Amino acid sequence: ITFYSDRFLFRDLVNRREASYANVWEMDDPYRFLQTEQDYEDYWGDNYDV
Amino acid sequence: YARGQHPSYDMVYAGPMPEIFPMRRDFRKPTRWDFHDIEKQGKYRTSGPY
Amino acid sequence: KNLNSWYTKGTMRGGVPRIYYAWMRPGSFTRRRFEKMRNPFVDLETGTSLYFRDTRDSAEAIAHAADSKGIKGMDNAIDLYNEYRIVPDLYPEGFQWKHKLNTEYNQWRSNTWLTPDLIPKEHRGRFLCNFQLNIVAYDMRVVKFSPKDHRQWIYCVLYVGSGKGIAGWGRAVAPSTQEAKKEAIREAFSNIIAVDLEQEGPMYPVRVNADGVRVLLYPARRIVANFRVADILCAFGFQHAGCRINLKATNNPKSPTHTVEGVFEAVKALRSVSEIAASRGKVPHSLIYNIYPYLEEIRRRKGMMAMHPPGKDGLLMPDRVVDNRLPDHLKRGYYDDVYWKDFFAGSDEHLNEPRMGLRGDEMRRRLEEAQDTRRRTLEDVLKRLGKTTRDLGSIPIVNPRVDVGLPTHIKRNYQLH
RNA sequence: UAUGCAAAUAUAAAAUUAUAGUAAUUAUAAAUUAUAUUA
RNA sequence: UAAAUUAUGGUCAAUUGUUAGUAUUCAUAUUAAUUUUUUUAAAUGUUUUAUCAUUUUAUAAAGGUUUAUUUUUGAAAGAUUUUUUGUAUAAAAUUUUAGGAAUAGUUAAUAAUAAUUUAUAAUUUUGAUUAGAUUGUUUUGUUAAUGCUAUUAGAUGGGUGUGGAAAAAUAAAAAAAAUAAUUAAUAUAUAUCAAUAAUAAAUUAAAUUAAUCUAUUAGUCAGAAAUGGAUGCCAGCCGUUGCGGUAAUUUCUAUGCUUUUAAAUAU
Ligand SMILES: [Mg+2]
Ligand SMILES: [Mg+2]
Ligand SMILES: [Mg+2]
Ligand SMILES: [Mg+2]
Numbered sequence: 025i026t027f028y029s030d031r032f033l034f035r036d037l038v039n040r041r042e043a044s045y046a047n048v049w050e051m052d053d054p055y056r057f058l059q060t061e062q063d064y065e066d067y068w069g070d071n072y073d074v
Numbered sequence: 075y076a077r078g079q080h081p082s083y084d085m086v087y088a089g090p091m092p093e094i095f096p097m098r099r100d101f102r103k104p105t106r107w108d109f110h111d112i113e114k115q116g117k118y119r120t121s122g123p124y
Numbered sequence: 125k126n127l128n129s130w131y132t133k134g135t136m137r138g139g140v141p142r143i144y145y146a147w148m149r150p151g152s153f154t155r156r157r158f159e160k161m162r163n164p165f166v167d168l169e170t171g172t173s174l175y176f177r178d179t180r181d182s183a184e185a186i187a188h189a190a191d192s193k194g195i196k197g198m199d200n201a202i203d204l205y206n207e208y209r210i211v212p213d214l215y216p217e218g219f220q221w222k223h224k225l226n227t228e229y230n231q232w233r234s235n236t237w238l239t240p241d242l243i244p245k246e247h248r249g250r251f252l253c254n255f256q257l258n259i260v261a262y263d264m265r266v267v268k269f270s271p272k273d274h275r276q277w278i279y280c281v282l283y284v285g286s287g288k289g290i291a292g293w294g295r296a297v298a299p300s301t302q303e304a305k306k307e308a309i310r311e312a313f314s315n316i317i318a319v320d321l322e323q324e325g326p327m328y329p330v331r332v333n334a335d336g337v338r339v340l341l342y343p344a345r346r347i348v349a350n351f352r353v354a355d356i357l358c359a360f361g362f363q364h365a366g367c368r369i370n371l372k373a374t375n376n377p378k379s380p381t382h383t384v385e386g387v388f389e390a391v392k393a394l395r396s397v398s399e400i401a402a403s404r405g406k407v408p409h410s411l412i413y414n415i416y417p418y419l420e421e422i423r424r425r426k427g428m429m430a431m432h433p434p435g436k437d438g439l440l441m442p443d444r445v446v447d448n449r450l451p452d453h454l455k456r457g458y459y460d461d462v463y464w465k466d467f468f469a470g471s472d473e474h475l476n477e478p479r480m481g482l483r484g485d486e487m488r489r490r491l492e493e494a495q496d497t498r499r500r501t502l503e504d505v506l507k508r509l510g511k512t513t514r515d516l517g518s519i520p521i522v523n524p525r526v527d528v529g530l531p532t533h534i535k536r537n538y539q540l541h
Numbered sequence: 542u543a544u545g546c547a548a549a550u551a552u553a554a555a556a557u558u559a560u561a562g563u564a565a566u567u568a569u570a571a572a573u574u575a576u577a578u579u580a
Numbered sequence: 581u582a583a584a585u586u587a588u589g590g591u592c593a594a595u596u597g598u599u600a601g602u603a604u605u606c607a608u609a610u611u612a613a614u615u616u617u618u619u620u621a622a623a624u625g626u627u628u629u630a631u632c633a634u635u636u637u638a639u640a641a642a643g644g645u646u647u648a649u650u651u652u653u654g655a656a657a658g659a660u661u662u663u664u665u666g667u668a669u670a671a672a673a674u675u676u677u678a679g680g681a682a683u684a685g686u687u688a689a690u691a692a693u694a695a696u697u698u699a700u701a702a703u704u705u706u707g708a709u710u711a712g713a714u715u716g717u718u719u720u721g722u723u724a725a726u727g728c729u730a731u732u733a734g735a736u737g738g739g740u741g742u743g744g745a746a747a748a749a750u751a752a753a754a755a756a757a758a759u760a761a762u763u764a765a766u767a768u769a770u771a772u773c774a775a776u777a778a779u780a781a782a783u784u785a786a787a788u789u790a791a792u793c794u795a796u797u798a799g800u801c802a803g804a805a806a807u808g809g810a811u812g813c814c815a816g817c818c819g820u821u822g823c824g825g826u827a828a829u830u831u832c833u834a835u836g837c838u839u840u841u842a843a844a845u846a847u
């Protein structure tokens with residue numbers, strides 16, 4: 025039930041607006057959602073292979 | 075990410091997780107309160123649907 | 125670390141069903157009034173100039189130095205179907221389909237259609253739902269019309285409810301039992317309240333008193349309440365509410381009336397979370413996902429996607445006047461090579477003479493669907509011979525029912541072929 | 542008809558009665574009640 | 581006088597009485613208890629020793645205390661060949677009675693003083709002393725919760741004063757100076773105040789060692805459940821509004837019928 029302020033997204037907004045990418049694959053790879061190991065452990069918990 | 079300039083993807087940016095492949099029809103499972111004679115659901119026998 | 129599991133939260137009421145929402149409230153579902161552009165906003169021309177403010181500097185909107193060409197950002201539609209939803213929806217669109225009449229929708233989906241007398245005018249064709257009727261109490265009051273005349277009037281308290289999020293309660297004093305029942309029911313449909321079930325129970329304590337009855341409606345793990353209060357709160361579809369009337373249960377005043385009026389009053393004082401969030405001018409945590417695609421193509425706008433064609437604004441003014449229209453005789457054989465001959469044949473919009481080029485049969489068809497002296501027309505000559513209109517087909521006559529010679533018929537239709 | 546003596550409603554409180562063991566309550570206000578010299 | 585994020589972290593507060601115009605925590609609810617049931621206690625002779633003696637063996641009798649109860653190692657532990665030390669008795673907080681007045685071998689200084697030392701003394705209305713009740717500062721019950729409501733029992737003056745310490749006159753369940761004994765936890769029929777037993781209270785059977793037990797209640801107007809028969813403001817019912825005036829679904833009786841099945845009822 026947290027209520028964010030109006031401008032809450034600003035930091036991320038200037039981070040996105042100023043991003044830059046070597047190629048377009050880096051721009052959207054499927055895995056940019058993941059940084060820490062916890063991220064990789066949540067994303068693949070399903071395949072016992074990976 | 076380490077200097078804090080990486081565009082964030084948080085759980086705040088996730089919408090609804092949609093039903094993609096609709097499961098199956100769940101057919102009506104016969105319970106003890108569905109009986110065509112009022113007798114089979116008695117007070118001396120049936121204390122509830124299950 | 126949150127030991128209450130959302131897995132087990134609730135109270136089995138036995139047979140009583142209640143609705144739940146997969147994601148949002150169903151009224152907020154189809155957004156078509158902003159999507160297909162039915163709103164008063166678009167109709168009033170005012171403010172449409174503002175899509176195009178870049179035109180205010182002519183040599184710039186050609187040059188494309190500034191990336192902002194549009195009202196909300198980089199272009200006029202970046203995300204049309206996403207961004208705007210980040211405002212809490214206070215006044216959702218609801219049910220918008222007109223394919224039947226309101227009374228036909230009402231008829232099919234609601235039992236309420238069967239009892240037209242029990243419903244007020246404002247709600248008449250408006251309900252799609254089935255309602256349960258629960259009669260809390262009957263009672264007798266003496267009504268004195270005069271110092272001799274005395275009537276026995278009775279007194280009803282009940283509440284109409286449907287677990288799909290809508291209830292209401294009423295009470296009445298009438299001459300007969302049936303009368304007071306019906307009166308109470310239309311008094312209960314007059315007072316109908318609804319509840320936003322996005323939150324499934326109150327997120328803060330509501331402390332409110334009906335006349336002399338102090339009520340507390342607070343968040344709980346499940347439904348806890350007096351049996352009656354409980355299935356009243358079930359009539360709204362609350363899973364997580366819990367509620368108490370008058371501290372100790374023995375506290376005065378306590379009547380069945382009081383018990384009902386209390387919980388309904390309380391629920392009527394409850395504020396939805398979305399409403400609270402808009403109230404402070406803030407963005408709810410739940411609605412932020414809608415901003416994501418916007419934020420996404422901010423990130424992705426680098427490079428060529430940010431680039432606009434040099435020299436070209438997209439606004440091309442008319443300069444000359446063009447008319448390609450032709451006299452009919454010119455277009456009679458104009459498209460013969462591209463398509464078949466007699467291209468415009470029965471076309472009413474594309475010809476000044478709709479009947480030209482037509483072979484006799486098709487000319488006869490039109491009149492066929494369309495339908496003073498001692499002379500015989502050729503019409504009744506056909507009726508007494510029994511040839512109708514079809515048999516004459518190698519003869520230049522189209523309209524059989526005119527009185528004129530064959531030569532006349534030839535000259536009237538001559539320009540057509 | 543304010544020279545003796547004389548604190549005392551202007552409210553700090555926990556269901557009525559009762560010297561603080563008696564009875565089981567009490568209190569309460571707008572429904573209803575035909576004659577007051579108006580063109 | 582700015583927001584914040586490297587995102588659910590530091591581990592669950594959550595309230596259930598069918599009422600009767602209205603005002604006021606007050607009958608009938610649940611939990612906890614007393615009503616209520618013999619599955620945990622127990623019998624007398626303590627014991628050595630150098631002989632009429634001397635060594636070992638220290639807080640369950642009663643009385644009614646609210647400014648109240650406080651202490652050592654010299655005994656044993658305990659180890660070297662002999663002289664071995666110092667630390668203690670004092671205080672501070674918390675203290676009850678619906679309607680409230682004085683209390684007294686008495687304060688402080690002197691000192692191993694004074695039944696007649698010296699002094700303008702001490703306790704009390706910020707509630708004393710007598711007098712009632714009462715076993716004091718990790719223990720319970722209810723509850724979402726600051727609360728409300730319990731907690732036993734055990735220190736009762738001196739008078740040849742022993743002993744390290746008075747705790748010293750039945751009433752153990754503490755092995756008490758040689759390994760009594762550990763194949764023991766079982767103690768028969770007594771007590772005191774505790775110690776919650778209707779332990780799958782009803783159909784397929786007890787991987788036993790078959791030992792203890794033969795086990796039932798309520799309602800029947802309101803509100804699950806009714807008819808006969810009496811009775812006639814009587815007899816009686818009464819958690820409560822109230823019922824009983826020859827037709828009582830509210831008494832009594834007979835028979836059925838109702839229950840969500842450790843019982844009704846009383847406190
Ligand atoms: Mg940042
Ligand atoms: Mg009461
Ligand atoms: Mg003693
Ligand atoms: Mg005393």
Ligand SMILES: [Mg+2]
């Ligand atoms: Mg003290």
Ligand SMILES: [Mg+2]
Binds near residue numbers: 650
């Ligand atoms: Mg002392």
Ligand SMILES: [Mg+2]
């Ligand atoms: Mg003595």
Ligand SMILES: [Mg+2]
């Ligand atoms: Mg009944």
Ligand SMILES: [Mg+2]
Binds near residue numbers: 817
């Ligand atoms: Mg009786």
Ligand SMILES: [Mg+2]
Binds near residue numbers: 826
């Ligand atoms: Mg008789």
Ligand SMILES: [Mg+2]
């Ligand atoms: Mg009878």
